[PDB]
């Protein structure tokens, strides 16, 4: 990645789901508040 | 019309009749498109008198 | 259209080789760089002859310098020196540099600089 | 009436007609055929009339192929027009045939009806011809 031109990619993103679930992912934010996601979704 | 004969001239040439071996005022001639580029053309070009590549501007 | 690294670099080598031509008075200095080895050659194209060739596969640099995986700038400098001496000992001074498809930079550049400090003219 | 749908230049060299046509020689579609014996220029009108005649006389017999076609333009200057001021107007279209060339092919009759039919066809042609049978 070239410097200063990219939005900072924060490597540590903790996924906090309202089932008091905490995982790790990555994305520009440090934490992601999630009520609806892959596991615990209407289908399967 | 929109395309023109323009005269390039040495900026460092002194018309006064200089004391060196070869006296005279270098001018080149060339064409410019007066619409596209309104900037007075500047060009580094050789001057037979000064013997060095000088800078030649334009004339009105 | 070749996107294999191999064929690509070959393409570049040929393109470069359009302009730079080995002559009796100006032999071509030919650089080959592979993953584990640095190999350099000197060619007169009229006579179709290699005059001098230095490589990492010779005992000189083997006993001098060892490296782990990729040839280092150090390695290259050593080679440039070896070919400088080898060629200066056959009466070959004035040569032309064939960068063989690799951008002039890194160990290629360093090779060149080595062979320049040591009396070879290019 | 047969004719090309397009060309760039309108007007074209008279050309010259020499030799034998080697390629149109064979009879590859039907059974009986009418073969050109002499080097000539066939207008599309003539081919029309020949085909028409052979078709009407065969009638109850089936099939007629026309192995030629008028693709080369031909030009004419009007009456009381002094020579000069440009090449004239293309009036009609010709097909160039050389000796040996097959013109008409025919199938679906006894040899007699075919002979009669092909004779009446040959009557509307500018050229001498021949009756030939498939090999």
């Amino acid at each position: 990645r070239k410097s200063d031109i990219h939005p900072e990619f924060r490597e540590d993103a903790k996924v906090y789901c309202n089932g008091e679930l905490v995982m790790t992912t990555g994305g520009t934010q440090k934490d992601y508040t999630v009520e609806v996601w892959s596991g615990n979704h209407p289908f399967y | 019309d929109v395309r023109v004969k323009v005269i390039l001239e040495c900026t460092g040439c002194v018309r006064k009749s200089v004391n060196k071996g070869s006296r005279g005022v270098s001018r080149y001639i060339t064409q410019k498109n007066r619409h596209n580029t309104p900037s007075r053309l500047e060009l580094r070009k050789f001057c037979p008198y000064c013997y060095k590549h000088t800078i030649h501007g334009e004339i009105k | 259209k070749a996107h294999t690294r191999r064929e690509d670099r070959t393409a570049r080598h040929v393109r470069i080789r359009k302009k730079v031509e080995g002559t009796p008075e100006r032999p071509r200095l030919c650089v080959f760089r592979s993953n584990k080895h640095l190999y350099v050659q000197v060619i007169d194209d009229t006579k179709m002859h290699t005059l001098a060739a230095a490589s990492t596969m010779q005992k000189a640099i083997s006993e001098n310098i060892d490296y782990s995986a990729g040839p280092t700038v150090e390695v290259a400098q050593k080679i440039g020196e070896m070919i400088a001496k080898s060629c200066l000992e056959k009466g070959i001074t004035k040569v032309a540099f064939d960068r063989g498809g690799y951008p002039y930079h890194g160990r290629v550049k360093a090779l060149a600089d080595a062979a320049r400090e040591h009396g070879l003219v290019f | 009436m047969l004719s090309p749908k397009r060309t760039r230049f309108r007007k074209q060299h008279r050309g010259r007609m020499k030799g034998i046509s080697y390629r149109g020689n064979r009879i590859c579609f039907g059974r009986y055929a009418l073969q050109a014996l002499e080097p000539a220029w066939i207008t599309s009108r003539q081919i029309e009339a020949g085909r028409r005649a052979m078709t009407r006389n065969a009638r109850r017999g089936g099939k007629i192929w026309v192995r030629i076609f008028p693709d080369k333009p031909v030009t004419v200057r009007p009456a009381e027009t002094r020579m000069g001021s440009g090449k004239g107007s293309p009036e009609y279209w010709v097909a160039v045939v050389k000796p040996g060339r097959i013109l008409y092919e025919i199938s679906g009759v006894a040899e007699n009806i075919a002979r009669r039919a092909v004779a009446i066809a040959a009557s509307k042609m500018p050229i001498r011809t021949q009756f030939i049978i498939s090999g």
Binding site: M23, T25, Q29, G39 | - | - | -
Partner: protein, 193 residues
């Protein structure tokens, strides 16, 4: 009702491990065995994922372009490329060099991370979801899926979004056949049909 996302929610997890190490630990032995290949390197790998926004009206107003660029950025952690139209096109009112769409390519690790945030975050948080089409393969084992609107990702803050803007996503893979690519995607947690 076959669930491969019980493999993706299974325990409290880490990123790099999830994608890159579920690939090397789990995915590869599986594919090795079920297709029976005669060397390791014949395993299908994810090569690159390019995301492409298609908006031609944005060439009229460059602020929309800048906005959409920063949006795609915050989504993907990458400041995009603005793709120019090659030819003069009448019916769409475009001349040469006009900035048409917006495109990014995600390679290496960022490819895996964005793939994760796709399957396990935005795809469920989408509008009424059923499963993605198994038939969207190109025949050489490269997959493509559309996104009608970008409210899917949390980085995109829905109230600050001016207008809904669409995105396309192309997964590119060393797979030569669709079966292998399909097993790869679904094994990695993808919601099919």
């Amino acid at each position: 009702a076959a669930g491969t996302a019980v493999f993706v929610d299974k325990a409290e997890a880490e990123t790099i491990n999830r994608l890159k190490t579920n690939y090397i630990e789990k995915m590869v032995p599986l594919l090795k065995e079920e297709f029976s290949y005669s060397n390791i390197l014949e395993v299908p790998k994810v090569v690159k994922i390019v995301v492409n926004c298609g908006i031609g009206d944005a060439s009229q107003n460059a602020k929309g372009l800048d906005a959409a660029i920063n949006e795609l950025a915050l989504i993907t952690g990458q400041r995009p490329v603005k793709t120019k139209a090659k030819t003069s096109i009448a019916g769409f009112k475009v001349r040469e060099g006009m900035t048409l769409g917006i495109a990014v390519t995600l390679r290496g690790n960022l490819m895996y991370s964005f793939l994760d945030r796709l399957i396990n975050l935005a795809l469920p948080r989408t509008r009424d979801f059923q499963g993605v089409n198994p038939n969207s393969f190109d025949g050489h084992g490269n997959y493509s899926v559309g996104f009608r609107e970008q409210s899917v990702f949390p980085e995109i803050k829905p109230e600050i979004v001016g207008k809904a803007r669409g995105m396309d996503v192309c997964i590119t893979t060393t797979a030569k056949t669709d079966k292998e690519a399909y097993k790869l995607l679904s094994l990695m947690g993808m919601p099919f049909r």
